[PDB]
């Protein structure tokens, strides 16, 4: 309910990554990655971020986690939580809270960097008169400039199809 | 964040509804597997295609015509490949 | 026949008739009788920002035209 | 022949073959390129006064410059 | 496994290596490594044993995390001075992550735990193509980004690669694990020179690829996995014996034979700096990694192990394979000592 | 009736294409009129933009000259950069010490309006 | 007033779902010869509201103490998708003027597939779980076809903005330049609503999610291919004719629900891939290659 | 480094064109017709030298040209220009195709008396 | 230094450790690799958005389509491993020894 | 090796994605355009080491354009001094909306 909304969504993003990086059951991992992908889409849309951030949400949370949970469920289940997972989640939460505290009550945080501690509404553009939605025209390339690029991308996709059928018993 | 306001209001409405509904009672097939991966690959090529209508105006329309037809023609090549090589059957 | 089923379809269509009319009524009611200014691009938003700045009431519906020149 | 075996596939190949061939032979592709080129997104900038060009007209009403007319002329 | 499909997959391996070589943009470097992975997985599992399945699994996990670490280093590079050119980097952390990604990509001693395992459970054609192309293609990228590397990275990984690929290797009777440990030793020998003169690195790459092609061709002529099978190939045919002799002694790096041109020219353009303790340490470890070559030779063609019969039955049927290119590569790999001024073929 | 149904389907299809072509060309005429609007309108808005950002810069430098008189070093209008060019400000040079409402209306206003 | 706009969106949809249940049951009763039932309530309305409160107050026979988190997240996700996804649908002036909304519709359809998978996993390792896995497959194999067809019918809009769609649909409709593509899209909507011919608790809430998804796809149909001319300073006319076309298409959706047998799953996947997917490719490449033929590329503003 | 130089508010005060966006969008083409002969000096200044705090004099000149144009459209024909911009005002995003009758009225007016 | 970059790089290191240390499963490891992919996607996309570097906005979409087909290959390999066994543990891969 | 069939065939497949200040699809600039134009025109025909020792100033200028490190440092010090003197109790400040 304040200005630091990109920071708050980044904090819940790191919350979700820890929440499935503590190695749970893989369907709970898929749930945690769904939460992380939703709030990361929120981050990239708050930088705006109109086209591409919701574009990938159709793929990343529209075409990937379905197959992930699919092959999760039909391969194995192992119906039983464990103390090591809860301990790793507590250590991840403690690392999160310690980084937040040393961003709040200090100036800079060094891993080997100098992060200026304030929610970045700045830097940001000074409202330039587009009238063409810059990133949409960006992705509206690949077709008048992307000669070699879409050729090798579609080529690798065709090879992906033939690789999948060969490994799953070509022909 | 206004759609976040809408989403939060509807999530709270649905959550209060479900909590009232629950706190007031008063093997495997490989043929199943290939459909998901085939979905995955063709949906990735959909993600390549679908920024075409944002692209529909430019200086070089023939290059866009050529590469867009190459994209859909490769999609048809892969589909017809697994069609002829008896993959997606039962 | 269908002489008796048209009341059910009619009331369900009225249930599909209220929300767009209420939304259009609230858009006309919450902008001083104006249609709501959409902002697809950065240009229309900058033009809307100077609109809400030259109001004085910090509200972009008044639009105070042509009698502010003299 | 093949029309009775798999008809929808043959119809798809036929409409696909006209989708490949047909954009060459057309009286409208150069019109498409002209319509698509001649829409100004950014500002057409002024430039330095004279190299004594018989072009670059000093007034936007002056007809000495390359303009479009075939929008209105069908 | 249709021949059209194999021609397509080998053409995609060629295309991945060409896209690695030819581009001036980081996205095509990542796409080249990635397409090389995606194409080199079904050269493995040409059989259907679970050995090849688990080997392709191990290779996929290590190769893919190396690719993701590479992409992390490139995104840090664009966080700093922002352009997608293949040149000097602008962060020691980014160059650190990138050299560790390429070190996992082609094998160093903290990273080599996938190499003998993935070479054990695959046939010899897949091992040949993965060794040659997967150790060829990232050397181009290191050759392009050499002016911006912290030296302790490359040199610690190279020293450790030579000594671990030496020490691990005196305890394997399998053929493929011997060849994999030899690959690790030669990756170390190429990497240690890279900040000094990279012509030596590319020439050592050419020599090691020709040597490995001769080695795997002399194992493709007669299906062997252990040294006992090598002694039975002593019994069936005599020319395979002397060529295993000469190519093993040229893997060892002895002066009249053409495996000494890589080591000694590296010694030259290493010691025209003031580094002397590092050449003598590397070359004593080059004395060390010759012993398993020498016991291999004692098994094959110098002593003679007693052979089972049915060689009496195998004598009627001559070795009617086709070799890829055995005699040309043999005489070019072993008789190429006095053409050391073909060093300057390369600039 | 199969040939006749095919014929009437292709006829209705071609009629739809012809009408859609005509309406899209008139639509392109109207979009070129919109471009004329933004072109002829622009320099007045550019002048107002320049005056407003120079006004906030002079105000904020005077604010800094008040607020930092108790520190060593610190000249009042220190260019961070070395070359003497008008670099575009970063909205932190512009919208600083404003406390909340106006900076949320100006920075993130377009992103979560409409 | 914006939360009041939210409430005036989300209050009529629940009444819309329950009265859709009465309308579908009584129009089955006046297609198939069962002239009724209408005794409970005058013309049958108190029977749907009592059916809603009956599914509210029903004795549980309670099996449901298994995997609390998944069992509380599957119906909540299905209902929040089905109840939030009329926001970009442009009943005359939409609730949020999203710059791109049809891709947002497709993303929420895939999240509904996630909720189906979560209920299938919460169905406790069963032949019902295998049937739910087949339902996931026959729901996921049509978001290819629906997205590609949607792409080609918005290629005549030029932009995703959907107000440009209501601009394009004034002279003629979008059924005439694409009738086979709209036919295949309608069949894809029959597949995505998971109903005939294409086939634990709270069953009432997954029921709610199904029917709100159907009315979403019908309103999205009526915007996408049909409609009337919008008039400013008179939105009520567009509301009238839009509601009439959506109601007629929903009754025709019932009219196809009644009179067809179900399909075997082999025939369903064979049908999808080997009949729709090359024909979608061919119609889509022809709708790509047509604006270069007719000098009509649509104005992305 | 060398500190920045900014003009103070002894110079950065021209009487602004205090009309809103609707009428300023509606009056575009005639603003391009009579005026906007000397604005291209301003715009050429801005595009050649990438420095505002340099071309502000020509910004003052284009601002007084716009204010004189609107004073001339207030003095002469006509009064239903108010009708024209209040007709284009409530039409959502300003299409030039909705209120075209009064555009024809305004064109006949301006051809009659200006 | 755009503070959100700090927590997103932190999330990258979190997902990297989740990839590297992993117990008795491969689906969770591949899913953490997918999370690391998402981290690279978000980080590169915030960079390209704030820098207005418009022509090379192909990096996020091409990064994600290529690493998505990587994930598809990994799922096919996991299905092959679980086909030649009963389960898909990190255990029972103990053959083909070093 | 760094083969240059890229340059031999005369195909600009990889010289447009590569750097800033190229030809964008609509002819638009970048955020730090002129900084890279001056830096590249400083270090064009230079052997990448005296390019370090001579074109360093414009490179640091471009880096502080890109990340804006020191400018955010200055803004942060301004806000911290603002906080300590408003806690001390001098001039509850009317620079916003007034003087
Ligand atoms: C979980 C988050 C789910 C977000 C779903 C996607 C919503 C969406 O697309 O919102 C778009 C809207 C801005 O619309 P856009 O298309 O970016 O147009 C440019 C300016 N109108 O964007 C917005 O209204 C703001 C972006 C989302 C902010 C809230 C994130 C909450 C988490």
Numbering used by the authors:
A (entry chain D6): 1 to 80, 85 to 175
B (entry chain D3): 1 to 26, 50 to 113
C (entry chain A1): 1 to 70
D (entry chain A3): 10 to 83
E (entry chain D2): 1 to 347
F (entry chain AM): 30 to 143
G (entry chain D1): 1 to 199, 217 to 318
H (entry chain A8): 1 to 114
Wording from the paper:
The ETC is composed of four large membrane protein complexes: (1) a H+-pumping NADH-coenzyme Q (CoQ; ubiquinone) oxidoreductase (complex [C]I), (2) a succinate-CoQ oxidoreductase (CII), (3) an obligatorily dimeric H+-pumping CoQH2 (reduced CoQ; ubiquinol)-cytochrome c (cyt c) oxidoreductase (CIII2; cytochrome bc1 complex), and (4) a H+-pumping cyt c oxidase (CIV) responsible for O2 reduction. CI is an ∼1 MDa membrane protein complex with 45 protein subunits arranged into two “arms”: a peripheral arm that extends into the mitochondrial matrix and a membrane arm that is embedded in the IMM (Hirst, 2013, Sazanov, 2015). In mammalian heart mitochondria, the majority of CI is found in association with CIII2 and CIV (SC I+III2+IV; respirasome) or in association with CIII2 alone (SC I+III2). Here, we report the isolation of functional SC I+III2 from ovine heart mitochondria.
Because of the hinge-like motions between the different regions of the SC, we carried out focused refinements on distinct sub-regions to generate higher quality density maps. On the CIII2-proximal side of CI, the four-TMH-containing subunit NDUFA11, which directly interacts with CIII2, is shaped like a lipid-filled arch, contacting CI with the ends (springers) and CIII2 with the top (crown).
